[PDB]
């Protein structure tokens, strides 16, 4: 049907929006600089560099997913738009 496809588009949009927002909030979660205790400084420094790297990668992936969604919406509207089709026909 058509309700399933549109609700899938809604699900994808809300999922990606909450994903990018959550990722930025966790980036600022690890952004507090504090005092260490039993954490072996260099280890968590390296793996937090690793985490922010993979999270920036997640941000880029989110942007690319939004681009794909925009392209799909562009395809969908032109093909099934009754009003747009009529104008071309009458001209």
């Amino acid at each position: 049907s058509k309700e399933t496809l549109l609700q899938s588009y809604n699900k994808r949009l809300k999922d990606d929006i909450k994903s990018i927002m959550d990722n930025f909030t966790e980036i600022i979660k690890t952004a507090k600089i504090e005092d260490e205790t039993q954490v072996s400084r260099a280890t968590q420094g390296e793996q937090d560099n690793y985490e922010m790297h993979v999270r920036a990668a997640n941000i880029v992936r989110a942007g690319e997913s939004l681009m794909k969604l925009v392209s799909d919406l562009k395809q969908f509207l032109i093909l099934n738009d009754f009003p747009s089709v009529n104008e071309a026909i009458d001209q």
Partner: protein, 117 residues
């Protein structure tokens, strides 16, 4: 698999070392072959290096972060300035539909009156 063998080296080597880590922990659950015994100790700090170095986590790895964010941004800003345009002109003259996942059009004079099957 000639490509991605170097990553394969780094990961199988890290795998063998973390296998040795699960090995030392496998002997850590042990009271036979080895006994546990707790007594504490001390380690005086040289600096406030957690914070200091965390600030470098921002400098270094947030520079890598901001670099990759700006690198994605420059790639995209370049990219935006062709398929979906051509579909317009085609849909403006001919007659199209989408069924399944492909795009199909018609040629026959069939909506215009013919019944030639």
């Amino acid at each position: 698999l000639w490509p991605w063998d170097s990553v394969r080296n780094n990961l199988r080597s890290a795998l063998t070392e973390m296998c040795v880590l699960y090995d030392v922990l496998s002997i850590v659950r042990d009271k036979k072959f080895m006994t546990l015994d707790p007594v504490s100790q001390d380690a005086l700090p040289p600096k406030q290096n957690p914070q200091t170095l965390q600030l470098i986590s921002k400098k270094k790895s947030l520079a890598g972060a901001a670099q990759i964010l700006l690198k994605g941004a420059e790639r995209l800003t370049k990219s935006v300035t062709d398929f979906n345009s051509e579909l317009l002109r085609l849909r403006q003259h001919w007659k199209l539909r989408k069924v399944g996942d492909k795009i199909l059009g018609d040629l026959s004079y069939r909506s215009a009156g013919s019944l030639f099957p």
